[PDB]
Amino acid sequence: GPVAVTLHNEAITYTADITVGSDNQKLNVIVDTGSSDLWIPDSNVICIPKWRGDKGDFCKSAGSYSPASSRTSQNLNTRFDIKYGDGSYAKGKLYKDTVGIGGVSVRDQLFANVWSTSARKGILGIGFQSGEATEFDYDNLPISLRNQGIIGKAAYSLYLNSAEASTGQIIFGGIDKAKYSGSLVDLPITSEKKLTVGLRSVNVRGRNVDANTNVLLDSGTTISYFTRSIVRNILYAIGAQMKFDSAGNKVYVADCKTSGTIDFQFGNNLKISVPVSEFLFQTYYTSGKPFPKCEVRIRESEDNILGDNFLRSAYVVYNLDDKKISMAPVKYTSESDIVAIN
Amino acid sequence: XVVXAX
């Protein structure tokens, strides 16, 4: 049966609650389609600061794992390493144990027990098996949920709720037919290791910007990024003003009230429109007073990425086994009508 | 923010 899992909006990502071990140790971790391995901080993890203000053990603030209290833990005597786009990293030991999520249990789930990391907390990677940072192929949560007979396929639906929403939902092996308008549209996954889809164009406030490229739909990314000229064209339409941060690096700003829409044209005639306001974020001076303008939550990068500020505007069904991603404009509702992903 | 794996 489809495993409905509650997502918690923590302002820069969406987390889920899982249990680990025979004692079902409660940990909270980031749901990330942009990686493939699940890792949780060890009870004695060494959290290293990456941001400014990172307190003592900020990374074990959502629980931690102690193999010792788990009658069913199993050290695999294999080192684990993984790096992420934002530069943070995680180092640990591979283990196997009973992992619980949304009322279901995954037996002998391989995952990593980290002793050093600069991430905010544990990360539940659910991408392609070929995306694992492990030097070999194993069963990650999705494939494991399928192999054990819980869900039909290594696949799940992502329902990042609305920007102001407190919770969202991700469904392993299911689809909540009542949370998306119109009809879902299939998009073939264009990469063998990353959850990428083809992007034809982007229309900003009436401005057509050809893309003819691939873009990463990643729940594990806070904002969105695009290639140099593409991002600059979007910034041009928006009318962004260039500023510099405390490091002398370029940053774009714009009037929070800036009107308009950003229409992402995907293949198979799928178009998702996202109001420019969803890409603007208001910061404040220490005096609580508003900054003159909002920050443009779109920066340039070597890769094209669409994260949370985009996905909240859509219902995303990732079908890893059938190598395809289906999308449709979202419909915000408590109501639900879940069916299995076939 | 974050950007999740190389």
Domain chopping of chain A, boundaries: 1-173, 174-342
- Quote the tokens at residue A298: 């779109």
Burial code (b: 16+ CB inside 10 Å, e: under 16) for A240-259 equals beeeeeeeeeeebbbebebe
**Strands, sheet with A250-254, edge to edge from the N-terminal-most edge strand:** A241-244, A250-254, A294-296, A280-281
Residue whose tokens read 């923590």? A10
Q: Alpha-carbon distance A267 to A212, whole Å?
A: 10
Residue A292 pairs in a beta bridge with none
Q: Note whether B5 contacts A83, CB cutoff 8 Å.
A: yes
- Residue A33, annotated ligand binder? yes
Among residues A97, A176, A218, A308, which one is catalytic?
A: A218
SS3 A260: coil
Among residues A32, A42, A97, A176, which one is catalytic?
A: A32
Amino acid at A212: N
Q: Note whether A86 contacts B2, CB cutoff 8 Å.
A: yes
Q: Alpha-carbon distance A339 to A6, whole Å?
A: 17
User: Is A1-173 a domain of CATH 2.40.70.10?
Assistant: yes
CA A311 to chain centre: 9
Kindly list the residues from chain A whose CB atom is less than 8 angstroms away from the CB atom of residue B2: 12-13, 30, 84, 86, 88, 119-120, 220-222
Conformation bin of residue A77: beta by default, left when phi > 0, alpha when psi is -120 to 50: left
How close does chain B come to A337, measured CA to CA in Å? Answer: 30
Residues 40-99 (A) with a CB less than 8 A from some CB of B = 82-86, 88
Q: Alpha-carbon distance A269 to A272, whole Å?
A: 10
User: Residue A339: what are its φ and ψ, rounded to 5°?
Assistant: -130, 160
- Smallest CA–CA distance from B5 into chain A, residue: A84
State yes or no: is A218 an active-site residue: yes
- Smallest CA–CA distance from A133 into chain B, residue: B5
Amino acid at A237: A
Rg of the Cα trace of chain A? 20
**Superfamily (CATH H level) for A174-342:** Acid Proteases (2.40.70.10)
| Angle at A223 (CA atoms; ends A222, A228), nearest 5 degrees | 140
Cβ contact A144:A106 at 8 Å: yes
- Residue A333, annotated ligand binder? no
Report the largest interatomic distance among the alpha carbons of chain B, rounded to a whole angstrom.
17
Asked whether the domain spanning A174-342 has the same topology as the one spanning A1-173, the reply is yes
Method: X-ray
Report resolution in angstroms: 2.5
Q: Alpha-carbon distance A6 to A224, whole Å?
A: 23
State yes or no: is A308 an active-site residue: no
